[PDB]
């Protein structure tokens, strides 16, 4: 549920979407999703399309995203726990 | 403190060079803020100094309290005409 | 009103969108808006997106833009006086 | 006068040389018709052989119509073999 | 009537809808109309929405559009006179 | 009178490359063929001598009465092995 | 035609839509259609708009398209034969 | 075998460098798999070495990936760090 709370945060914060995008390729994001999200001009808008492409309540996809965040920058997880 | 740092800091990061930028990237990488690849992306950005700075500043966007602080403290050991108090 | 009058010039006259960007980022442009304007290919298109963020009724944002123009290029500003 | 000065001598200014270019951008910063930023980008990022010209040609869009006179007068400091100079 | 005589041609011939838009913004086009025309991806369709906003008897806007066309390309303006 | 010279030689310009490409488009700027803005738009596209060429080719919609041709004369001043065919 | 059979593959596979677009110009479609196809962000969506312009009953244009496919990517076509 | 090559991973192919990527694109051009356009598109548009590599990964040539044993065999020619060589 942490994720949903930073579903809002990260859409306005993270700037490394293209790398996280990897963590979901085929796992959760097919090429139709992938290209669409990549085509967006801003990192905020890239995340906006991305999170509308993961409407699954499945914890797996959320957990994969978190692991991606942990392996990408490793900072936002503490910064959003506050 | 934290929110004040960044708006005032785009404000003053326009007064700088490449000696500074080069060193900045080394510490921001080693302080685990971002990967080799983003450091590579900023270095291979088709600009010289200026847009590369706005790029580092796009790394302070997700930045938390300590993430701004590591940058500002790195600024501290030089002539901070940036007015870093 | 001067800037609103001459925006048709300015959209296609002043080049240094990035300098102008700084002041507006502080006052009016949020980070997502900053990225949006930056993603546009041409200085004319960059300004076009900028003026779409600028509220027409706001003197303050207009005035900040003018000051930005003066402190970026006041020699365009002198050619506008002429 | 100013409008004419840009209207032509562009393919002709495209056949110019680093000697003049190097001196020119230094003085354009000094005369403040050119900003620090754009000159800083153009010298490295743009092509050396040619895009060097297209850089000052990015002043052709009124970054100084009075600067057209400043440019031509700087051209007068050396061999103004181009027409209108 | 110059426009009503060539409407089909110039809808599909001129590329710089956005440039033409600048003059219109100043005189006739409000910001809403500007954004509307810009939101069309393809230049022929972008012009189609432009001319759908201006198919009335207002001669001032029509007349200023001609001068805009003369200042736009200076090539198609002669080529359509011929 | 010139449309067909490219209507049937379109894909041929998908082989035209090099800094001849920039040059091809900076003559059209001098004449009223391309605006400064359109010249800027073509240059800000990021293909190597491919989409560039298709952008200029998007500027052939104008009856090239003296436009389509001004391109052809620039093609003539270059070794047009495609024209030679 | 195989192409009609395998169009679902094609929309998701062929990553040089722009080259194919070149061949289909003066020979098949009207350039308004060129710009239209080019507009949408993804290669899958670009192909989707392309096939919506291309009549299935027009066998002639389909042959030229196949030759274009053979000359464009030149490996996918043989993998589609397999 | 081909299917596994089509998936494998990206993060593992992402952990590469220059002096392999350059040689990969050379062979992919010469093996007629991608034309000049994709070579130009990868080398010009996709600047970020990673972005470049994700672009070659978009040259997985979807169900054209019998050519991707040209890629795998080039990986075999050099130091393979991947578990799925």
Author numbering:
A (entry chain C), C (entry chain D), E (entry chain A), G (entry chain B): 113 to 194
B (entry chain F), D (entry chain E), F (entry chain H), H (entry chain G): 2 to 86
Authors' account:
NLRP1 and CARD8, two related inflammasome sensors, are highly expressed in a number of cell types and play important roles in both host defense and human diseases. In general, inflammasomes leverage supramolecular filamentous structures to nucleate the polymerization of caspase-1, which in turn increases the local concentration of its caspase domain to facilitate dimerization and activation. Here, we determined the cryo-electron microscopy (cryo-EM) structures of NLRP1-CT and CARD8-CT filaments and analysed their assembly and specificity.
Specifically, we designed the type IIa W169G mutant of ASCCARD and the type IIb G20K mutant of caspase-1CARD and connected them in one polypeptide chain using a 5× GSS linker. We then determined the 3D structure of the octamer at a resolution of 3.9 Å calculated by FSC between half maps. There were eight CARD subunits in the map, four of which are similar to one another but differ from the remaining four, suggesting that there are four ASCCARD and four caspase-1CARD subunits in the map. The ASCCARD and caspase-1CARD structures were clearly distinguishable by their fit into the densities; in particular, the shorter α6 in caspase-1CARD and the longer α6 in ASCCARD allowed unambiguous placement of ASCCARD and capase-1CARD subunits. In this assembly, there is one type I interaction and three type III interactions within ASC subunits and within caspase-1 subunits, and there are three type I interactions, four type II interactions, and one type III interaction between ASC and caspase-1, which must have represented the optimal mode of interaction between ASC and caspase-1. In all three types of interactions between ASC and caspase-1, ASC always uses the type b surfaces (Ib, IIb, and IIIb) to interact with the type a surfaces (Ia, IIa, and IIIa) of caspase-1. Extensive type I and II interfaces dominate the ASCCARD−caspase-1CARD assembly, with calculated buried surface areas of ~450, 600, and 220 Å2 per partner for type I, II, and III interfaces, respectively. Detailed inspection of these interfaces revealed several clear interactions between ASCCARD and caspase-1CARD.
